[PDB]
Each structure stands twice: as structure tokens, then as C-alpha cells.
Amino acid sequence: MRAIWTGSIAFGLVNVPVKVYSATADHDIRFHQVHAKDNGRIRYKRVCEACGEVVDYRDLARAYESGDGQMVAITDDDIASLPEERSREIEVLEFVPAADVDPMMFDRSYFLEPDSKSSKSYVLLAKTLAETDRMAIVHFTLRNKTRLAALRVKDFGKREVMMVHTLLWPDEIRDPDFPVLDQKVEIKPAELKMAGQVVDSMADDFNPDRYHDTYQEQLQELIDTKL
Amino acid sequence: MRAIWTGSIAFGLVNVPVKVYSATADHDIRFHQVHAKDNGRIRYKRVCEACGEVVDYRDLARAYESGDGQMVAITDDDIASLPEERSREIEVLEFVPAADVDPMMFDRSYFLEPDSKSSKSYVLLAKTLAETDRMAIVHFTLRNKTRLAALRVKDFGKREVMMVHTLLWPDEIRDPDFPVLDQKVEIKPAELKMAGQVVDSMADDFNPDRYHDTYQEQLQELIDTK
Amino acid sequence: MRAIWTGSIAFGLVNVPVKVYSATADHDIRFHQVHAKDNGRIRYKRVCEACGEVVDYRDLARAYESGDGQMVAITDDDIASLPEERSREIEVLEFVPAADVDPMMFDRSYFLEPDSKSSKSYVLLAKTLAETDRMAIVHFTLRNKTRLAALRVKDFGKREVMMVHTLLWPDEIRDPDFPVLDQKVEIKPAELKMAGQVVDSMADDFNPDRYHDTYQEQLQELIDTK
Amino acid sequence: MRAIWTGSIAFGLVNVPVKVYSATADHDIRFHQVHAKDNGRIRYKRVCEACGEVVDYRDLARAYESGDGQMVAITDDDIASLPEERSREIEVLEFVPAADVDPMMFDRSYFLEPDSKSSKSYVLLAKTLAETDRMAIVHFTLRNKTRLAALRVKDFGKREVMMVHTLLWPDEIRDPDFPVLDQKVEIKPAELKMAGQVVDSMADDFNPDRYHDTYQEQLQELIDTKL
Amino acid sequence: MRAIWTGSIAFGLVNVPVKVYSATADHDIRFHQVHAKDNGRIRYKRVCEACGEVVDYRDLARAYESGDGQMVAITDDDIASLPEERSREIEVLEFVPAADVDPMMFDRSYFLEPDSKSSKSYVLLAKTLAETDRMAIVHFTLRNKTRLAALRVKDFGKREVMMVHTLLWPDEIRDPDFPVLDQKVEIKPAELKMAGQVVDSMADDFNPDRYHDTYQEQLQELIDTKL
Amino acid sequence: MRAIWTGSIAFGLVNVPVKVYSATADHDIRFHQVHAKDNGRIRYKRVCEACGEVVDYRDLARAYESGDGQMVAITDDDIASLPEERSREIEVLEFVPAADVDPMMFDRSYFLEPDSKSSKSYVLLAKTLAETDRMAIVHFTLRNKTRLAALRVKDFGKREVMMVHTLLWPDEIRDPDFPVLDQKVEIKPAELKMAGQVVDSMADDFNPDRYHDTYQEQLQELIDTK
DNA sequence: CCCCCCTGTCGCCGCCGACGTC
DNA sequence: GACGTCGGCGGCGACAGGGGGG
DNA sequence: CCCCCCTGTCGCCGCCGACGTCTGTGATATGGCGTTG
DNA sequence: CAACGCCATATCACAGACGTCGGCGGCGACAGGGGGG
């Protein structure tokens, strides 16, 4: 366990400290690319095609490939123009109910953990959010990149915790083109009840215990057999 | 927009052809790495460690490195032991009410559209799912990988589109293993009632049109100047 | 310098890390007890009246003497019933105008430093305090001895740092019980005129740069020579 | 309420008698150690650390340790060097406006009341100071320790007594050298206005009566319970 | 050798403390009275003019007799008409050159020995008076009886002390409006010159040493011889 | 006004009868003592204490109370040993310059007026002593009490009178033996200037007519009311 | 103090729908 | 009406810096 | 990672406040002598 | 016809100086423990 950032929520003047944690930990085994004949792992070296020589990270300049096939180098100052890089606070913008968030924009969920000294000023805000049951659209900033996100509280029975959901930009979600539904619809209700009863035939709820990653278990058994 | 893959929702006698799109595709500008002296693209090439030279990808043996570090030679017979990967159709295993679905477990959104002209089945399934309001849990099998997913509908006004939302396994969620938040800390209710209106001082509603990425717009304009 | 402690202001939702420092360092010279016969640094032993033997710090019991002088054996668990001192927060209580604290009460002055990498909340609080011109009275706690204080802001050349001034409990400030001045003495205007003349003849303006402790400098020079 | 002084303000040939009094009495309770196991009161005995024998107060020589761990015995000539302590007078130095002394410096306060016979000069000087609104910075020698101070008047309604506020030597007060605040802090204009209602929601008037040491009163009640 | 007063020279603010001392102590043979037959001391009997019985001190009352023999009753406040009786200080009034006042009015003298802590102010005042050789007129109010006096500095070589000389009221000096003084005589100059040289015939200087008390010394010899 | 006694100044072969007068006759008001309820004077009589009997003044023992509290038997011859009282004249001893004696011992002043038929003598001594300007140190005798006095000449405008001032025994001028003033204290020049300014502010001239015993005046009014 | 993990980042690899075309 | 080529679209998996905590 | 600095005790010296001791001053109330009685 | 205004003398009453004694409180130093690096 290791936090990925350390900052304070910057709403108003509150400056409540928090420690960000990644909820979705990659339990899946990460495979490696090696060659059995030499038993030595492979490495990647980038060589200019015409030059025929390897290069170091310092000599490469980022170039944006346009539709015209023209390369333009990117300067550090131009990319560095963003002033939020030095900001280590989750700059809250406004508080909104959680019912109006489109479930399509969720990207990743992080766990917020406060500082022991100021636990009083964290649990208070969490309790207020729970009582009002509202999100809080923030401007999450990490690795010199800003990811719009919403902050919401999910009670875990014993305690309350704050978590931030990275949100896709509303312009990102692509509008669909639907030339199929334009046709007239004439459905006999006689089949409506039949279909509805078919749907209700498998009436049940979530069963997390039954939901087991079969392939992951098989791979785990295989690697155990290897040893 | 070209569908990533096309298939059908095969569950017993119920079967509808479907072409699957991607609801979201990163529109952030991507740049090609170049070398200043070259002023052109640079190509990565695999090099063997002991050999000191480039070895073809086809001559590389699958392996996994654990804590012990034993040399693992993964073949194809064990990888193909799962027959689900071959299956190009997606079946509903169970049904669950919409409320039970949590916002936590969404992974990605894929748009579903039909292929044949038998639009009766599409609208019928959309209507019954909307009325029952129970999410169709599916073991999505695409890209020869199987992941849990749920199918549902939302009202576009113009369209009653049915489409899926990938899900992750319960093993992927870490627990909040820290009792610091569990400390019994009392709070003066006056503090709560004075921070209340403070919270609502900014109260508003979702306005997706207003929100945008300032950095991406700045980069777009900057490259436009270039 | 070296911080005495590191807590954080807290009134309801608001919070801000602060790092107190000592603002009055006395450069008066501390000596050590030595004896000429052997020139060895003295050592102290806790010695028992009744039992006539050395009794350790751990084996030493605290007690109290009342008006009758009866010994009272106290216990640590009972005294610790107060939970406030455990708090590591400068729990602000109210905001009041700065001019409403007579110089009777000020006891000690302490600087403040924002702890986290970002000082936005600290700077904003300092600015609002400077503008509205209001002191903030806090229940400063330190070393398990809670002591009332007050928050005020005053610029020093380059910064608008704000400081906390400890305060005396109003019941501590005595009163001038003196029936010798309430008597009225006959006086003449010429006496007032001459008194004003003599007083204002010696009047001047504060120039602290030329005020120093002659005894301290003398001792410093004497030790330097030795 | 037992005096600690009997001198006289003397700037020239004035010499108004004054009785200095402690203006801050600590109601805090001071405890006492004891060997409760055998019921034996505790006393401290000065014992050599090297030669290891108990000694009397006279023998120990006041010794100073420098960076080299030296030891110099302070003799009588050190006392003889400064003759200022031989004076029992509050030798007024200058008269300045009261506004010229900052609250940074004030250290302790005492109340001056005169010998009953010389009340005339006492009240005349206090009245002159009050009317002309002047500080009266002085010197001060209590138990052989010369401390700067300031003499300022203060009306108490029925009576008007002048008091001496001891001052810290201007060099003693520390200077805040904090580079963190020097770095530029940027705040959007709408942010600052928000805090005004936050502080205004808690504004009040300073009333001494409300505040009281709960710890001390609880301890007093507890000990009353013990008896 | 024991003091009589503890006040303070108080004009404006100078308020210099002083302990007035007696300069004219009667060294005569202070005698006592007894009776031979009883061989014991005596005591008066306060018998009325009419009661015929001894009256206690408290019961007696004050009154005055005029030419007509009437009586007057004085109340307690009547005696306290002048508030200056309550005064407990030598309230200086003015300052005059020493040579101006005639030695006619000088009635009694006293010594002023200041309080130790007030040596500076008293020394400054004495030096000031000596430099300008200026007297000072003061209402020396002692033992409830006001009395005009005069304050000046007398050198003693070792140190300078300031004494207060009581002054008789100017109206007290009887006017010699007598006719005998008016008459004048015709006087030859030669007799004036011979008389003058006769005056010089017994020239001498101030020699109080050869001056002695005859009767007092003889009584001292007698009282030494008797016992 | 009645002269206290009449004698002469007999020094050498020069004699001049004189009429001594009380120069300083106190005008302070003397009130008697009466028991108001009695309405009469309280007459005191010498009464034996040891034997408890009324004793007349003609047998009281002239006894002393020394350190041991003994008793003294005094005869007439021993107290009559001194023959000076037998003389009823003033004896001029010598002559000394007047400016070199301080007024410390000057006790009482008495007027001298001519009693001789010949006016020549009185004016002769008056003028010669006035011109020589030398004090005439003489012995004064009165009612068995002999005290020294000095004769001087004072002009009252029209009149010139030789006049006698009593003097005290040399041992009666006590000494100011006290080390408190012996201690030497440094003087600051600025304090000296301040003292000179303040004292000079009240500097004035002595006019006899201004000063009256205001208490005596108000007592006069008070008695006048009755 | 050291000393060790986590995530943008992008080039290499691979596959399947669209629409030109037989 | 039915081949099958292409092009893009996505994913795989290695890497390069960012901090975290004792 | 730590060594510094609050905080509480202790012992010590120096200082004040009340108790006890006597001593000198102002006034009453008579004498002897100048003067009248 | 030269003893009764003015000055001691007695002391009586009364207000104040001066010396002892016990207690109260600054303060210089140490010890312990916390939370800073």
C-alpha cells in the first residue's frame, strides 16, 4: 500500500488534508516478455531509421503528427504554461446531488484518507455530504495533468469515506447516429407480457461470491503447478 | 465510427445481431516521438539480453516472473484451456434490479446497435428492460477476453438505445484497511448547522456544456498557431 | 528554528496546518552548579524523610497539601478525565475586534508557520483577518496544559504572518484594592502647569535601538576575558 | 497581596514613593511530591557526581559551561562591576507617547501605590500623565536583576492608578524569517469574499467572564471530593 | 536623638521625604516633686469648683473667659475648621533669598534627615538651595498646630543638611511707639571717639568654649556629691 | 504694656538704667478649662499619693527622679551658692563682629528703653555700638535665672534702640550625626538644570504682611459667633 | 534515509468492419 | 451477391519519471 | 532518525507586615516676682 | 505702697519612632519527558 498523492481539498478556505489511494488495484498477474533460449528478458531500444543509431531521451523532441504528415517539436515552456502543475490541492468547484451524474463518465475511483491531526475537519465534511447526499465536482490534478472528477461519500457501515471519480469530459462522449430506429414501430402487446415474464424468469440479485474470474484462477493454478 | 466488433446476444432461443461501438474514445491529441537530428519518427526494436542483438518477436517465449523467479515457459495448450474466448456471442447469466448496480463497478461503456432489419426484437428488448428496470448481467467476450458486463437502456428521447457497461471482478477492490477514520470524534452540532449553508453557498446542478478541458483547448490553439 | 509543536487551526469545517515557534528567546546565560573541592557538576538525589533513603522518580508519589496540611495521595487515571488537552488543534472559539484586549492579559507571543506545501488557506485567513480587523480567540493547548490565547495578524517587512498571544484567565488579573487614593487632595492650577512643564521638558520619542542590558553585556565581556 | 517593593519614581528631584504589587496571581494549584509507600516527605540533597559525597549550598561554586565544557567560578567582583542594583529607585528615563510601545514587548505588569503621606505627588503625576497621554519608560531593579519597563497610567473609574509594564529588551523579540509566505500566493477575487461571512458568522464581543479554565475548576472540585 | 516627625517636603511633585529632628533639647536639670512625710511622688486632684469631687479626664470640656467672664463651648468640628491640620507634610509656599529675612522672627530650629531611598532628590534640592542661597517659606504644620517656618541649607563640611526655622508671625512684634526713643541729644564727637576706642579696648571673638553654664554645672556637682 | 523688670547695664565704669520689655508677646488665644455640667473651673491641688492626704505647696519635698529613681534632699544654702542672681544688672563682657554668628541659638529678643534722667548716655552707647557694628556679648539675669544675651542696635525708622537677644548654652546646639547623608551620590547636570528651573519658577520675595495664622482668624470668627 | 512502489507514456502487435471491387 | 483489401481502431506490454514512508 | 525546550520542583535569599518597646510635645494649673494690693 | 503678667515648673495626657520576629515570593538550577527532524 502506498498513496499516489498528498494534498488538501481546496474548497473555499477549508484546506482539509487527504491522502489519495487507488481503489482498483491490479490483482491480475502482469506478464513479462522474455526469450527462453537465452533466459534473458527483452529490452526496447529506439533507433532512427535513416540514422541507424540509438538515441537518448534528451535528444528526442515530442512531435505532433498532423493530417498533413508534418512534424513540429514541442517546447517545455509551452506545455509548462499550465499553472495547475504546482497546485497540490483538489480544487473544488461546486456541490451537486449524485442523482444527476451520468454513469457513463466514471473512469476511476480513488480512496481519500485524512491526516490524523485534522480528522475532525474531515469527518465533519463527510457527514455533511452524507446528510445532504451530494457529490462535489472537483479538478483533480496529477502527473502534470488535470482530470475533472466528482467527489462523493459512500458509507461503509462502520465509517464514512470520501472518494473521487474521474469524469470524462461531456464533449468526449460521442453522440450516436441511429438510422435504424427512425422506422415506424408496431409491437403487439400480446408478446410484451411474455417477454416480461421471460425477463422475470431469472429474478435474482448480485452474487459476488459466485462471480469468480475463472481465467485468473486457472492461471494461478498453472503458475502454482510450475512451482 | 466503425464498430470494434459485431455479434449477437445469444441466450437460448433469444438471439439478436448486434454491432458494438465504443461509447468513449480519447480525443486528446497524441504526438509522435521524433529525434531532433533525424527530425523524424524513431522506431523501437526488441533486443535480446544475452544475445546483444535484435530477436524476432515470433522467437520469444512466453514467461512470467514471480517472487521465486522460476523460468516459466507458457505454451498455447494451457492458454486455450478456456473455451469461452472462442465464443463470439454474449449471453445473459442472471437479472438484477437497477438500484443494485453500483457506480463503483463501471469500467467502460460500449454502444450496441443492430445489424439485421429485424428491429422488432431490438425495440422489444429495450422496452421490456426499461419497464422491468433490471440490468442484464452479461459475460462480455470480446477481443478473445472475457469480462463481466451489464446491459441496460437509457432514454435519449429520440432513441431507446440498449448498450452495455463493462464491470470488474470483486477481487479488484481494495479495502479501507485503516481505523484512523474510526476514531470516536464528537462534533458540535452548531458546527454542522453553520457549515451547512456554507456547503449550499455553491449549490448548483450538473451543466455538462459549461465544463471543458482548458489545457486541451490551449494546446489545440497553440498548435494551430504553429 | 525549532518548533515547539505542530498542530492545525480548526473551527468547524475550516482547517489549516500551522507550525508554532518561540518568538521570545532570552539570551541570558545559564550556569551549572559545580563545587570547587572537586570541580564536578552537581547531582541531585531524591531522599526520603520518613524512610531516610533515596527514592526513584518512578517510585516517587505525587500528593497535595491543603489548608490543614493533610497529605492527599493523587492518582494519574482520575486527573486525566479531561479530554480536551489530548486535542492537538488550536480550536478557534470566536472572532473579536483586536482593540478589545487590554495589554494586561498578553502573556507570551508565538509565531505561526503553514505546514503543508500549500499555504493558500493560511494566507487567505491572514488576509481576511487583516482586512476585517478582528482578533480570533482560541483555546490554545500545548504540553497537556490548555491555556487561552488570541490570534492576531501583524506584518513583518516581507510577510503578513499572524501570531497567537497567550492570555491570562480573567479571574487571574487582580484588582487595585487600595483605599489610599480614593481620597481627594486639593490641588492648584499652577501646580498642574508646572508639572506639565517639567514632564514635557523631558518628553521624547521611543528609540529602542539604543536600549540594552548593561549587566548582560558586562557579564558577557567578563566571561570572554576569562 | 503582600508588597514586593518600596522605592520611588525619581526623574530629577521628584521621588514619589511607590509600593510595587504583583498584578497577576496564578490560581493554578501547585502540588507536592512525597514517598507515599512509606509516607515520607521528599527533600533534595546536592551530591557530587564524581567525588560522590553530599555537600552544602555554600561549597558549590556557580559555574559556567561554554562550547568547550569549561567551568569558571563567578566571584564577588562580578557583582561589584555593576552598581545599578544598589539603587532602590525606579529611575525614570524618558517620557514618550503610549502608542510607541507594541504589544510584542510587554512581559509583566505591576501596580504602584504610594506611601499614604505622599499621595499628593502620586496623584499629580498620574493626572499629568493621563492628561498629556504619555508613556514613562523607566528602569527596574528587583532582587538584583535590572529589567527595562514602562510606566503608564490607567483609569479604574473611582481611582486612577499608574502601573509598570516590564519590557523585553528590543533585541530579545524574535524576527519572523519565513520564506514560505514570501513565495507568491494567488487567490481568485470571489474566493476572498466568501470567508467574510464565515468569520462574520462567528463574530462576537470580547467578554472576560465567559472564559474560564475548566481544567482547574474540575481539579478543584475533584480535590474537594477527595477530602 | 529620636525623631519627632515623618512627613515630606511637598510642592508640586518634589515630595522629598524628611524626618524632622529637635535641635534645641533642654539639657537642664529636669526636676521631680515628692513629699517628705509620705516619701512618695505626688498627683493632682481634678476637683470641680462646685462638685467637690475628683473629675476624670474625659468628662472635662473646653471654654474661654473674656473680660466679662462669660464662657464659650467649642464643638469637635469647630476645632477642625482649618483642613491644614490634617496635612502631614511641609507644604512649601515660595522661595526667598536667605539674606532678606531678619533674625528677629527666628523662633526654633529643627534638622531634616531624609529617608535613605530618597537621598538623591533631597541632595539635589539642598544643592540647588545652596547654589542660589535661596531660603524657602513653608507651613510647618506639626502636632495639629500650624506654624510658619523657614527652610534653608546649612553646610557642615562633611555633608550639607537643611534646617527649618520656625518664624514668629510678623504681627506679633510689638511696636515701640514710645516717646523716650523720639528724643535726641547733642553729643560731642570727641566723646564719641573716646567711647569708640574704649569699645575696641575689649575686642575678642566668638568663643563658646570658655562659655559655660554656671548654675547648671554647680547643680550637677551637687547631684553627683549627694549620691 | 508693662516692662518685666528694670535694671541697668553696668560694664566697667559705664552704667545706664534700662527697662526690659517683651519684644515678642504671643497673641495666641488662651482658653481656660471648665467642666460644662459643673459650670465651673476645675481647681487642682497637690495631694499625697502614698499617704492619700491633701498636701499644701509649702511642705512638698524638692526631690529628684534619677536613673535609679531615688529621692533628693536639697537645702537653701546649696541652691543659694550661686551669687549671680543677687545682681540686677546686665554685664557687658566683650565685643565681637556680628556678621559671623548664625541664628541657631537665638532664642528670645527683648527691648531696652531708657530709665536714666540723662538721655546722653543711652544715645552714646546706642550710636557707638551701631557704628562699631560689633555684638556686645553680655549676661542676662532675671528671676534667679541667668542666660547670656547679645546687645545690638536696630533702626525702626525714626528710633534707634540698643536691644538684647537671649542666647542658648553651646551644648544645646545638637549635632546632625547621621551617616545617611554622608553617603556620596552623583548628580546629573540635566537634573540640576531642571531643579534650577522649577525652583526659580516659585522664586519670590518675602513680604511679612501676607502671612497670617488663618486658623487664628477663623477661631476669632468662631468665638465671635457665640 | 532510503529506498522502494505506481502510473502516464507511447511504439509494437494484432484483428475486424467498410466499402472498393469482381 | 459476394470477394477480399484496406485502414483504422484497438489492445499489449514495455518504459520514465513522480513521490511515500520508517 | 534525533537533541532541544517546556513544565514542574526544590531550595534559597531577600523582603514585607504586624507586635512590642518607650519618648518627646502641647497644654493646665499652679508659684514669685515686677506692680499694685 | 510696693505680689499678681509673665515666665518656669510639674506632669499629664497623648501621638509617634524604632527594633524583632515570622512568614511570603522571586529565581536560579535541575530532572523528566515531549516532539520537534
Question: Does the CB of F61 have a partner CB in chain D at under 8 Å?
Answer: no
Residues B120 and B19 in one domain: yes
Question: Does the CB of B120 have a partner CB in chain A at under 8 Å?
Answer: yes
Give, as ranges, the nucleotides of chain J with any atom within 7 Å of a protein CB. Answer: 5-18, 24-37
D70: alpha, beta or left? (left if phi > 0; alpha if psi -120 to 50): beta
Question: Does the CB of F200 have a partner CB in chain D at under 8 Å?
Answer: no
Grouping H, G, I as helix, E, B as strand and the rest as coil, residue B157 is coil
Write out the H or E segment, with its range, that includes residue F97. strand F89-97
Q: What are phi and psi of C122, to 5 degrees?
A: -60, -45
C-alpha cell at A82: 499550465
d(CA A218, CA B79): 9
User: How many residues comprise chain C?
Assistant: 226
C-alpha cell at D113: 501605590
C-alpha cell at E70: 462669660
Q: Measure Cα distances from D101 to C153, D108, D128 in Å.
A: 17, 14, 19
d(CA A67, CA F60): 151
Write out the H or E segment, with its range, that includes residue F223. helix F214-225
Do A7 and C89 make contact, defined as CB atoms within 8 angstroms?
no
Q: Are strands E160-167 and E148-155 parallel, antiparallel or unpaired?
A: antiparallel
CA of D42 to C1' of I10 (A): 10
Residue whose C-alpha is closest to residue E147's, from E56, E222, E85: E85
B90: alpha, beta or left? (left if phi > 0; alpha if psi -120 to 50): beta
Question: Does the CB of C96 have a partner CB in chain F at under 8 Å?
Answer: no
From chain D, the residues in CB contact with A13 under 8 A are: 191, 194-195, 198
Residues B149 and B184 in one domain: no
Residue whose C-alpha is closest to residue C104's, from D134, D170, D108, D99: D108
Answer for the pair C73, C82: CB distance below 8 angstroms, yes or no: no
Question: Does the CB of C12 have a partner CB in chain B at under 8 Å?
Answer: yes
Comparing CB atoms, the residue among A7, A89, A121 nearest residue C15 is: A121
CA of F2 to C1' of I35 (A): 9
| C-alpha neighbours within 13 Å on the C-beta side of residue E14 | 28
What is the identity of the amino acid at E197? Q
How far D12 CA sits from the closest chain F CA (Å)?
A: 5
Per-residue three-class SS string for A36-99: CCCCEECEEEEEECCCCCECCCCCEEEEECCCCCCCCECCHHHHHCCCCCCCCEECCCEEEEHH
d(CA C44, CA C46): 7
Residue C58: which nucleotide is closest by CA–C1'? J32
Residue F143: which nucleotide is closest by CA–C1'? I33
Q: Taking the alpha carbons of E170, E171, E172, E175 in that order, is the dihedral positive or negative?
A: positive
Q: Which of F191, F192, F198 to mutate to test the interface with C (most CBs of C within 10 A)?
A: F198
Question: Does the CB of F195 have a partner CB in chain D at under 8 Å?
Answer: yes
Instruction: Kindly write down the DSSP assignment for every residue of B190-223, as one continuous string.
Output: HHHHHHHHHHHTT-----TTT---HHHHHHHHHH
CA of C53 to C1' of H4 (A): 107
What CATH number is given to the structural domain containing B117?
A: 2.40.290.10
Method in brief: cryo-EM
- Residues 23-52 on F with a CB inside 8 Å of D are none
Residues F140 and F164 in one domain: yes
- Please list the residues that pair with D53 across neighbouring strands: none
Residues B102 and B12 in one domain: yes
Is residue D181 in some structural domain? no
Residue with cell 508554532: C20
Residue whose C-alpha is closest to residue C147's, from C172, C130, C114: C172
What is the identity of the amino acid at C53? E
Going edge to edge, which strands form the sheet with E91-97?
A: E7-9, E16-22, E106-113, E160-167, E148-155, E134-139, E91-97
- Give the largest CA-CA distance in chain E: 73
User: How many residues comprise chain F?
Assistant: 226
Residue B113: which nucleotide is closest by CA–C1'? G17
C-alpha cell at D166: 516590564
Grouping H, G, I as helix, E, B as strand and the rest as coil, residue D22 is strand
D15 Cβ contact list (under 8 Å, min separation 6)? D8, D9, D89, E14, E15, E16, E17, E118, E120, E121, E122
Residues B113 and B20 in one domain: yes
Other CB atoms within 10 A of residue C60 CB: 16
Kindly identify which residue of chain E lies nearest to residue F202, measuring between CA atoms: E94
Is residue B96 in some structural domain? yes
Is residue E182 in some structural domain? no
Do E202 and F93 make contact, defined as CB atoms within 8 angstroms?
yes
Q: Taking the alpha carbons of A212, A214, A220, A221 in that order, is the dihedral positive or negative?
A: positive
Question: Does the CB of F194 have a partner CB in chain C at under 8 Å?
Answer: yes
Is residue B147 in some structural domain? yes
Number of domains in chain F: 2
- Strand I atom within 7 Å of C22 CB: yes
Residue nearest to nucleotide J26 (CA to C1'): D143
D206 Cβ contact list (under 8 Å, min separation 6)? C96, C97, C100, C101, C135, C137
Q: Which domain holds residue E103?
A: 7-26+81-172
CA of C22 to C1' of J28 (A): 22
How far B191 CA sits from the closest chain C CA (Å)?
A: 5
Do F127 and E192 make contact, defined as CB atoms within 8 angstroms?
yes
d(CA D152, CA D95): 10
| C-alpha neighbours within 13 Å on the C-beta side of residue C151 | 29
Question: Does the CB of B194 have a partner CB in chain D at under 8 Å?
Answer: yes
Is residue F138 in some structural domain? yes
Strand spans (E) along chain A: 5-9, 16-22, 32-35, 40-41, 43-48, 60-64, 89-90, 94-97, 106-113, 134-142, 145-155, 160-167
Residue with cell 462567528: D202
CA angle, F83 then F89 then F94, to 5°: 95
CA of E166 to C1' of G7 (A): 106
d(CA E110, CA D118): 21
| C-alpha neighbours within 13 Å on the C-beta side of residue D9 | 35
C-alpha cell at B196: 451547512
D122, burial (CB in 10 Å: exposed 0-12, middle 13-18, buried 19+):
buried
C-alpha cell at C68: 490543614
Answer for the pair F133, F162: CB distance below 8 angstroms, yes or no: no
Can you state the angle between helices D189-200 and C120-132, rounded to 10 degrees?
60
d(CA C52, CA C47): 6
Can you state the angle between helices F189-202 and E119-132, rounded to 10 degrees?
60
Answer for the pair B91, B10: CB distance below 8 angstroms, yes or no: yes
What is the identity of the amino acid at F51? C
Question: Does the CB of B100 have a partner CB in chain A at under 8 Å?
Answer: yes
F174 Cβ contact list (under 8 Å, min separation 6)? E21, E22, E23, E24, E25, E111
C-alpha cell at B96: 438484477
How far B213 CA sits from the closest chain C CA (Å)?
A: 24
From chain F, the residues in CB contact with C194 under 8 A are: 198, 201-202
Is residue A70 in some structural domain? no
Instruction: Kindly write down the DSSP assignment for every residue of E70-117, as one continuous string.
Output: ------HHHHT--GGGT--SBEEEEEEEGGGS-TTSEEEEEEEE--GG
E211, burial (CB in 10 Å: exposed 0-12, middle 13-18, buried 19+):
middle
How far F5 CA sits from the closest chain E CA (Å)?
A: 17
Q: Find the DSSP H helices in B55-171.
A: 76-79, 119-132
Residues F11 and F101 in one domain: yes
Is residue B68 in some structural domain? no
CA of D183 to C1' of I4 (A): 29
From chain F, the residues in CB contact with C198 under 8 A are: 194, 197-198
Grouping H, G, I as helix, E, B as strand and the rest as coil, residue C43 is strand
Answer for the pair F137, F148: CB distance below 8 angstroms, yes or no: yes
Residue C166: which nucleotide is closest by CA–C1'? I6
From chain C, the residues in CB contact with A14 under 8 A are: 13-15, 121
How far D178 CA sits from the closest chain A CA (Å)?
A: 20
Other CB atoms within 10 A of residue A153 CB: 23
C-alpha cell at F120: 546722653
Residue nearest to nucleotide J34 (CA to C1'): C143
d(CA F27, CA D151): 51
Answer for the pair F170, E101: CB distance below 8 angstroms, yes or no: no
Q: Which of D13, D87, D162 to mutate to test the interface with E (most CBs of E within 10 A)?
A: D13
CA of B20 to C1' of H7 (A): 19
Can you state the angle between helices B119-132 and A189-201, rounded to 10 degrees?
60
Strand spans (E) along D60-210: 60-64, 72-73, 94-96, 106-113, 135-138, 149-155, 160-167
From chain C, the residues in CB contact with F202 under 8 A are: 194
Size of interface C-D (CB pairs under 8 A): 356
- Strand I atom within 7 Å of C142 CB: yes
DSSP state of F143: T
Residues F168 and F190 in one domain: no
Residue whose C-alpha is closest to residue F33's, from C142, E128, E48, B8: E48
Q: Find the DSSP H helices in chain E.
A: 76-79, 119-132, 179-182, 189-200, 214-226
C-alpha cell at F132: 562699631
Q: How far is CA C15 from the centre of its chain?
A: 25
Residues around strand H, C-beta < 7 Å: A 2-6, 19, 30-33, 41-44, 57, 143-144; B 2, 4, 22, 25, 108, 143, 145
Q: How far is CA D172 from the centre of its chain?
A: 14
Q: Measure Cα distances from F147 to E177, F91, F165 in Å.
A: 28, 11, 10
Residue whose C-alpha is closest to residue D85's, from B211, E128, E208, C215: C215
Comparing CB atoms, the residue among D15, D117, D124 nearest residue E118 is: D15
Give, as ranges, the nucleotides of chain I with any atom within 7 Å of a protein CB. Answer: 4-17, 23-35
Residues F104 and F214 in one domain: no
Question: Does the CB of A12 have a partner CB in chain D at under 8 Å?
Answer: yes
Question: Does the CB of C187 have a partner CB in chain E at under 8 Å?
Answer: no
E210, burial (CB in 10 Å: exposed 0-12, middle 13-18, buried 19+):
exposed
C-alpha cell at E137: 517659606
Residue nearest to nucleotide I8 (CA to C1'): D30
d(CA D215, CA F211): 68
Answer for the pair E185, F120: CB distance below 8 angstroms, yes or no: yes
Question: Does the CB of D79 have a partner CB in chain C at under 8 Å?
Answer: no
Is residue E144 in some structural domain? yes
C-alpha cell at D123: 496623584
From chain A, the residues in CB contact with D191 under 8 A are: 12-13
Residue whose C-alpha is closest to residue E206's, from B177, A150, F101, D157: F101
Question: Does the CB of E114 have a partner CB in chain D at under 8 Å?
Answer: no
d(CA E181, CA E173): 17
Question: Does the CB of D19 have a partner CB in chain E at under 8 Å?
Answer: no
Going edge to edge, which strands form the sheet with C92-97?
A: C21-22, C109-111, C162-166, C149-153, C134-138, C92-97
Grouping H, G, I as helix, E, B as strand and the rest as coil, residue E139 is strand
